[PDB]
Design a protein around this ligand. Structure first.
Ligand SMILES: CC[C@H](C)n1nc(N2CC(C(C)(C)O)C2)c2cnc(Nc3ccnc(-c4cnn(S(=O)(=O)C5CC5)c4)n3)cc21
Length: 300
């Protein structure tokens, strides 16, 4: 059959989690900001703690734990461990800049072409990795891309990942519930559109029930003002009826990489290049002592 999944599920003690405060709540559940202080290791890891006491809630979150514990890529979010309390909690890496959707909306005036094109390469890299691991995300959107640093993004939310977000879904998925890596490619094109429009809602005001009809007639999301025909043509290719005619994620990495070498040729932004976003070599970016990021804290 398939290859044995030898990933390790780390059961973490409640007593090892300090300075807990709410980051956000919604349909997704509740995400808390915390500090993981393991054993006598002299490390304080900034963490995010997710929870959806119901047996069906524990089933769904343990399915997300299963997928999230099985992934290992710089552009994908890995599970650090789980905490078994009244409800099952997922322990993950704190992404200080939150989701990419809210980031593009709040920092629109300082987001340049190089940042936008790099985010596209990075999302495609993480997506290609999921394809290698034979995983179909089934919920790629700008809301599910987290910002570690303005120059480093990662894909998350494995609640729907396998081996309804209508406005992000490929037409085969809306009509026949068919999900493939090529259906994820359609969602990637919508994710790209969301970025290029600085967080615009796709098909705003249009009800979900009308989307399938809109797509069948031949209607697609419009060309963002900053997008050259070069960038939009890539988005359009992700939205073709025939899934096999859509680009492969490895081709999106190549296409956006070439473009990111001359970003002003592919994205037209007023007051470009001069736009600055916080870097790790800048003041007040970071007890403070013994703080180690999850990407630098390997195994026990
Ligand atoms: C995505 C929204 C979630 C509430 N959230 N908010 C953050 N903070 C906002 C705060 C400021 C204001 C300072 O910007 C940063 C934040 C930081 N790290 C992680 N960490 C991770 C890591 C891996 N996965 C997840 C994860 C998985 N599912 N979800 S979700 O269901 O909340 C997603 C659909 C929104 C988050 N979170 C998640 C974070």
């Amino acid at each position: 059959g398939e290859a044995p999944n030898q990933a390790l599920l780390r059961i973490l003690k409640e007593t090892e989690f300090k300075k807990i405060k709410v980051l956000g709540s919604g349909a997704f559940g509740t995400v808390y900001k915390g500090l993981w202080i393991p054993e006598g290791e002299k490390v304080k890891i900034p963490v995010a703690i997710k929870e959806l006491t119901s047996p069906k809630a524990n089933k769904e979150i343990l399915d997300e734990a299963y997928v999230m514990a099985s992934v290992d890529n710089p552009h994908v979010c890995r599970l650090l461990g789980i905490c078994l309390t009244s409800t099952v909690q997922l322990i993950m890496q704190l992404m200080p800049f939150g989701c990419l959707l809210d980031y593009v909306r709040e920092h629109k005036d300082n987001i340049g072409s190089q940042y936008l094109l790099n985010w596209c390469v990075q999302i495609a890299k993480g997506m290609n990795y999921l394809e290698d691991r034979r995983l179909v995300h089934r919920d790629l959107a700008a809301r599910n891309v987290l910002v570690k640093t303005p120059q480093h993004v990662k894909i998350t939310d494995f609640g729907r990942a396998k081996l309804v977000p209508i406005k992000w879904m490929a037409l085969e998925s809306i009509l026949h519930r068919i999900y493939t890596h090529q259906s994820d490619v359609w969602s990637y094109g919508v994710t790209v559109w969301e970025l290029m429009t600085f967080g615009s809602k796709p098909y705003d005001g249009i009800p979900a029930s009308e989307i399938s009809s809109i797509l069948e007639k031949g209607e697609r999301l419009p060309q963002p003002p900053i997008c050259t025909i070069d960038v939009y043509m890539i988005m359009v290719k992700c939205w073709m009826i025939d899934a096999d005619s859509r680009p492969k994620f490895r081709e999106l990495i190549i296409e956006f990489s070439k473009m990111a070498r001359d970003p002003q040729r592919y994205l037209v932004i007023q007051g470009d290049e001069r736009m600055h976003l916080p870097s790790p070599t800048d003041s007040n970016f970071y007890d403070m002592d013994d703080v180690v990021d999850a990407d630098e804290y390997l195994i026990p």
